[PDB]
């Protein structure tokens, strides 16, 4: 029912009435040569490089953009097709410079992996070769527009997803260029992602630029942690060093796109790094030590203190395996008092079943929604790929989007509804329009961001939006279940950390003065020694030395994110194990194995040694940390929403402002952002 039986190469196949010759011939396993067609873009017909000879016809058509009628004989290999592909791809290889000694796409470029397989055998021009000039765009994208097969693929990118309409087509005939007519710089998030799109060596990387050819790298897949959704990358080592990283095209997150910060931040891995254990020396001095001095040094103080005078904070980018060796060491001594760096208010729940603390509609359900309301967040500069999914789903079907607080620049036509916490209280009632379109919605979606919930009125706004999430779901609600209330984040290892059974928000240490703290937070200054009591020690365990490692007693090294098999959890409860790329330099070690040799030199010895025994200890506590990349159906929060009505805190008087600047707050955030000097070199080119 509803298909056309179409014969490719004299062999039947059944396609929908309305597909292409391209996709139908790609169903029986053939690749016609493609230039002007990428899947995640629109379709143009401006290179004429798919030329199928359709049977019983004089003419030759483009298989990129035409429907498939009643059952043709799509005749791919003939003697008129092969006279066309060979004839089109002698044209563009004429007006073209004679590089591949020095052009940087010398390994993959598609004037080269066509032109052995398809295409001609020799050249007949024999002099000419027009030569246009280059220019600059930014300090990310080296631009040599001499090369330029003029496929108009980078230009349809900008009018699409990355909604800055900046590039164009300037000229007539052979005389045309591509780049921006005025000298405007083109820079946003997703700005460096065009250098994958560009099918020849025109757009190429600036920091990587002249280092290594791509038949030598060793691709090992991995997951990146600088952000909420995680990533899907593939690192590329040459001789034990990271050269550059790519996207990996997972079908739900990173559809094919990667974030710009996550691409150009491998320099911070190897610039300013701590390699060895260091001893106290009694002044502001702090000097290196051999590995068997500073082990029983701190392990001496464990046998002395007891009770709540020792604690630990951890809220950065460490995994969910070096956050079990901490929890079973501080709670076999029965002194828990430990929290993450991030502030998250708990009112009736929060550690138990979490009820909205994971993003309940997944990313694949965002394309199914109809009316999206979101409050208290600037979604552009935190989880940008979730923003691009809105940008896709705002197009290609209808969508209606409103926002509360702080008029900012989102690329699609939203409307600033109001700017106060009191808009939330009135929208529980019927007023201040759209007013009932949430009630008149078929698949609603109400996002709270984690930028507003960090504030002092967090227990109010948590219960306020859960009321209107209750108000919609008790009406019908949707059809249907269609989980409504949800949240995102901006710190990667929090959902991994919190669903081990920690507490949210640094409050327990904020009241009492415990003596010794372990810092794995750490660079955010929510605790200083001034807020601490006097010069009683704190022992630091990390890999960078930005803020908190100069103010420390004994520091211990660790491996960052490309050096250890780990586990991280994005905002849907997936579990994405990163893998080994480089072994960590110097005397640095893995994080969770320095804890056992802290344990075994002290009294208590933990009943697990290898990494498989660690993950069974995970499977004891949480059984969904080995169910890799699966989103189970479990909401259970009708009980939670009434029980979260227990706390009756009210709102405040302040506009829900995000921390983010025009762009400039996007670059320098976490830890690896800070030490990476290319972020330091692309930040002064913004301000000028």
């Amino acid at each position: 029912s509803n298909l056309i039986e179409v014969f490719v190469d004299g062999q039947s196949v059944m396609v929908e009435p309305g597909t292409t010759v391209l996709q139908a011939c790609e169903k029986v396993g053939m690749q016609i040569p493609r230039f002007c067609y990428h899947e995640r873009l629109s379709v143009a017909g401006n290179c004429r490089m798919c030329l199928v000879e359709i049977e019983k016809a004089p003419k030759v058509v483009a298989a990129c953009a035409m429907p498939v009628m009643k059952g043709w004989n799509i005749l791919t290999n003939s003697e008129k097709t092969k006279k066309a592909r060979e004839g089109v791809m002698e044209f563009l290889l004429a007006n073209h410079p004679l590089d591949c000694p020095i052009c940087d796409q010398g390994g993959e470029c598609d004037l080269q992996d066509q032109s052995m397989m398809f295409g001609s055998d020799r050249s007949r021009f024999l002099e000419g070769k027009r030569a246009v000039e280059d220019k600059n765009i930014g300090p990310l994208v080296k631009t040599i527009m001499t090369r330029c097969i003029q496929c108009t693929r980078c230009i349809r990118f900008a009018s699409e997803i990355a909604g800055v309409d900046d590039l164009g087509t300037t000229g007539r005939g052979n005389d045309m260029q591509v780049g921006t007519y005025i000298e405007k710089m083109f820079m946003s998030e997703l700005s460096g992602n065009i250098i994958d799109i560009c099918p020849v060596g025109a757009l190429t990387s600036k920091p990587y630029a002249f280092t290594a050819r791509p038949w030598e790298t060793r691709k090992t897949e991995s997951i990146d942690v600088m952000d909420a959704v995680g990533s899907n990358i593939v690192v590329s080592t040459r001789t034990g060093e990271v050269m550059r990283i790519l996207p990996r095209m997972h079908e739900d997150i990173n559809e094919e796109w990667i974030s710009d910060k996550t691409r150009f931040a491998y320099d911070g891995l190897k610039r300013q790094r701590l390699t060895e254990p260091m001893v106290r020396n009694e002044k502001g001095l702090l000097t290196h030590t051999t590995w068997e001095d500073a082990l029983s040094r701190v392990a001496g103080m464990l046998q002395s203190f007891q009770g709540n005078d020792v604690a630990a904070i951890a809220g950065g980018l460490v995994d969910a395996e070096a956050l079990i060796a901490l929890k079973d060491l501080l709670n076999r001594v029965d002194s828990d008092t430990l929290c993450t760096e991030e502030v998250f208010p708990t009112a009736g729940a929060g550690t138990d079943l979490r009820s909205n603390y994971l993003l309940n509609t997944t990313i694949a359900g965002v394309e199914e929604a109809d009316v999206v309301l979101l409050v208290g967040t600037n979604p552009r500069f935190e989880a940008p790929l979730f923003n691009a999914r809105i940008r896709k789903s705002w197009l290609h079907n209808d969508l209606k989007v409103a926002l509360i607080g702080s008029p900012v620049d989102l690329t699609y036509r939203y409307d600033h509804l109001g700017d106060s916490p009191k808009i939330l209280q009135d929208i529980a009632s019927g007023s201040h329009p759209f007013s009932q379109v949430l009630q008149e919605a078929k698949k609603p979606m109400v996002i709270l961001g984690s930028s507003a919930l960090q504030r002092n009125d967090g227990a109010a706004i948590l219960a306020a939006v859960s009321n209107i999430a209750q108000k919609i779901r008790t009406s019908s609600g949707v059809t249907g279940d269609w989980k409504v209330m949800n949240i995102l984040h901006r710190i990667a290892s929090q959902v991994a950390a919190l669903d081990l059974g920690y507490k949210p928000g640094v409050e327990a240490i904020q009241k009492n003065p415990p003596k010794m703290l372990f810092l794995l937070g750490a660079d955010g200054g929510c605790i200083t020694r001034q807020d601490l009591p006097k010069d009683c020690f704190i022992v630091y365990q990390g890999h960078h030395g930005d803020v908190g490692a100069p103010i420390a007693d004994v520091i211990l090294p660790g491996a960052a994110y490309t050096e250890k098999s780990a586990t991280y959890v994005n905002t849907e409860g997936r579990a994405q194990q990163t893998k080994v790329a480089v072994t960590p330099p110097g005397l640095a070690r893995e994080d969770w194995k320095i804890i056992r040799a802290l344990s075994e030199i002290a009294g208590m010895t933990l009943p697990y040694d290898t990494l498989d025994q660690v993950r069974n200890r995970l499977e004891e506590v949480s059984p969904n940390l080995v169910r890799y990349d699966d989103v189970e159906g479990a909401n259970y929060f009708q009980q939670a929403s009434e029980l979260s009505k227990l706390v009756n805190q009210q709102l405040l008087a302040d506009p829900l402002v995000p921390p983010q600047l025009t762009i400039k707050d996007f670059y320098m955030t976490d830890s690896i952002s800070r030490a990476s000097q290319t972020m330091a070199k692309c930040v002064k080119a913004v301000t000028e």
Partner: protein, 208 residues
């Protein structure tokens, strides 16, 4: 088609088609596939029980002598559910023709050795034992040829990484010449040369 392209002939493509038609007709206990190579050669698949008789049928006859064993070899293939591949090869000295005998096998399943039929395959069978581990049955002399006295890997198969485990050296700690764990002074870079776009349309796998 043109110059610098090999001219074929249909003479040998018809005779070697017609000849080995009746090697499957008159021994249909063993022969389970016969196919004609496009460059005028013959392959004939034989169940490993017919290792001795279909040689012995060939070994002496009036219509197919094949009295010279040119090459016994062996190929290993993971993902086949029966690993190896034993390939015999013979020469009709009266007739100027070639035919290959491709008998599949496994590790633990022995093969009846072709020692009595041809005395050429005495050394061609001690060798394959050392390089893969195929145990040829009732061999009159099975030993250790082409390897050292300490290898236990059977190295020409896909599970033995290229450099060994036993990189050797000397020391004066007594007098001896002693082994060690393997210790390279360079990585042995592994390049990547397998380029996309599926350049060969004729040999194309079924779509699935």
């Amino acid at each position: 088609t043109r110059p610098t392209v090999r001219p074929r002939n249909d003479v040998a493509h018809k005779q070697l088609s017609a000849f080995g038609e009746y090697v499957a007709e008159i021994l249909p206990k063993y022969v389970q596939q016969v196919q004609v190579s496009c460059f005028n050669e013959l392959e004939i698949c034989i169940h490993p029980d017919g290792v001795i008789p279909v040689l012995t049928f060939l070994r002496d006859h009036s219509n197919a002598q094949f009295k010279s064993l040119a090459d016994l070899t062996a190929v290993d293939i993971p993902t086949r559910q029966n690993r190896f591949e034993i390939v015999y090869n013979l020469l009709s000295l009266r007739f100027n023709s070639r035919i290959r005998v491709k008998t599949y096998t496994d590790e633990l399943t022995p093969i009846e050795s072709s020692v009595p039929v041809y005395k050429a395959a005495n050394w061609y069978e001690r060798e394959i034992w050392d390089m893969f581990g195929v145990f040829f049955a009732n061999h009159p002399d099975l030993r250790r040829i082409l390897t050292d006295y300490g290898f236990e890997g059977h190295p020409f198969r896909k599970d033995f990484p290229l450099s060994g485990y036993v990189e050797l050296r000397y020391d004066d700690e007594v007098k001896r010449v002693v082994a060690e764990p393997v210790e390279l002074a360079q990585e042995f870079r592994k390049f990547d040369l397998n380029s996309p776009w599926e350049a060969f349309p004729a040999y194309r796998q079924p779509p699935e």
